[PDB]
Amino acid sequence: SVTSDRTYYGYGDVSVKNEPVNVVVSPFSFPGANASLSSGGQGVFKKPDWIRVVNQSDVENVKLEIDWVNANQAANYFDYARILVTGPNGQVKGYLSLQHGKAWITLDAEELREGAVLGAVMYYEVKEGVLASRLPLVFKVRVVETG
Amino acid sequence: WIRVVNQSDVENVKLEIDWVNANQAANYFDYARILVTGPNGQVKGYLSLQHGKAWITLDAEELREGAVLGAVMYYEVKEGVLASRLPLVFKVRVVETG
Amino acid sequence: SVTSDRTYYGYGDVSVKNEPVNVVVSPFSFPGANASLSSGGQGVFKKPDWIRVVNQSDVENVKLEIDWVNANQAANYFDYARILVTGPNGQVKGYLSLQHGKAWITLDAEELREGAVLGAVMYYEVKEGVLASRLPLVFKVRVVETG
Amino acid sequence: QHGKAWITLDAEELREGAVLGAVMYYEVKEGVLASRLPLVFKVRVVETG
Numbered sequence A, C: 001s002v003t004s005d006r007t008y009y010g011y012g013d014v015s016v017k018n019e020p021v022n023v024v025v026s027p028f029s030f031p032g033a034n035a036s037l038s039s040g041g042q043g044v045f046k047k048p049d050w051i052r053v054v055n056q057s058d059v060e061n062v063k064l065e066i067d068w069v070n071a072n073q074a075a076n077y078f079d080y081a082r083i084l085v086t087g088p089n090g091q092v093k094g095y096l097s098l099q100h101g102k103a104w105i106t107l108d109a110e111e112l113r114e115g116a117v118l119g120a121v122m123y124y125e126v127k128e129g130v131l132a133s134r135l136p137l138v139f140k141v142r143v144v145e146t147g
Numbered sequence B: 001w002i003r004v005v006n007q008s009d010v011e012n013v014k015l016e017i018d019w020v021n022a023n024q025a026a027n028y029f030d031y032a033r034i035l036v037t038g039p040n041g042q043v044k045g046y047l048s049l050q051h052g053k054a055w056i057t058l059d060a061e062e063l064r065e066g067a068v069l070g071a072v073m074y075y076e077v078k079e080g081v082l083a084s085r086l087p088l089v090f091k092v093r094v095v096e097t098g
Numbered sequence D: 001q002h003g004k005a006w007i008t009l010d011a012e013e014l015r016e017g018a019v020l021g022a023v024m025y026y027e028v029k030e031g032v033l034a035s036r037l038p039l040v041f042k043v044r045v046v047e048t049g
């Protein structure tokens, strides 16, 4: 007697909670301790553990764009400064300077699955006679493409 | 995921599976491909954000063993989107039975 | 009674996880230890194990483009500097200098399948009277074509 | 580019159990890194007898 409207349903939900990556920063105070940086000096500064990239259990491929924003200010203080981002396990995937300001370090399934540390190695020459204190160095980490 | 239980007489079933909120999930996903893992290994249905209709049909051998329809979903989340408990709703129409 | 829509399906997935190559760097500190580099001096410096190229189990053909970016800076310090990339197993596939800046070292199925080490041999003459410390030397490794 | 196949089986090939394997020749575009990419092929039975 009834003419059934023949429609039954099924459903499900998808939970996207976190962002793919956590860029834990441990900043560097490069004149260091028990050391000394003088005006006009030239040298190298090394920090083994600077940016730790922590991924979630699914993320396997990450493309990071590292960018130096205040480089035009440090141009008035340094004469050459070369930052090498000591990548995952000995590889060096990034190089920033006062002129070439963008890096594109990319990590894949082997480098993430062991804990990705990005140290810094800085080659510096202080412009002649410049005396400063607690100069800032700020790098923008953009996650451009993850998978 | 979808268990189709028939009565003792029904032998031929034509189901129209339809994804209604796909135009909403288009704002969240970049590609999403649902494969309706059919009765006993066959895959009779494929839905995506563009092609929205499936026509999975079961016959006398597949019903007489208990028809399970699993789902296999291939997904890529749009860049940077963070959500919680998003709904996915599929309309099951029985178009023709025999 | 039913008019079957005659379409069945088959499927599969392809997993591209890693990048073809890992350029493990072990940098060189060429004045070395128990040695000495003087101003105006002339000589040779050798490092047997400098860039180790580690491939995955499938990659067999690799074309690397080695490029010296800060050569125009070292031109103000050196008068001639010639880097020979001591290739896989005695072959020397690369030669960089202050003028000719690009190398195209390419490894094939025999050289990869034994562990590809790329040492450096540097022939140098320091410009007259120049005194420096911890000068940087940075080479860009581009993987142009793998197979 | 050429996306359609028309494989047809006759009385000898069916009567022994028809398996259809796949052999794939591939070159991955330069630098692309993916995971669990889908490959979906539509099987239409156009004419049976």
Ligand SMILES: [Ca+2]
Pocket: A018, A019, A021, A022
């Ligand atoms: Ca977070």
Ligand SMILES: [Ca+2]
Pocket: A145, A146, A147, B076, B077, B079
């Ligand atoms: Ca993505």
Ligand SMILES: [Ca+2]
Pocket: B009, B010, B011, B098
């Ligand atoms: Ca009946």
Ligand SMILES: [Ca+2]
Pocket: B096, B097, B098, C001
């Ligand atoms: Ca009917």
Ligand SMILES: [Ca+2]
Pocket: A108, A109, A110, A111, C018, C019, C021, C022
């Ligand atoms: Ca890698």
Ligand SMILES: [Ca+2]
Pocket: C108, C109, C110, C111
């Ligand atoms: Ca060879």
Ligand SMILES: [Ca+2]
Pocket: C145, C146, C147, D027, D028, D030
């Ligand atoms: Ca290739």
Ligand SMILES: [Ca+2]
Pocket: D047, D048, D049
């Ligand atoms: Ca027929």
Ligand SMILES: [Ca+2]
Pocket: D049
């Ligand atoms: Ca017949």
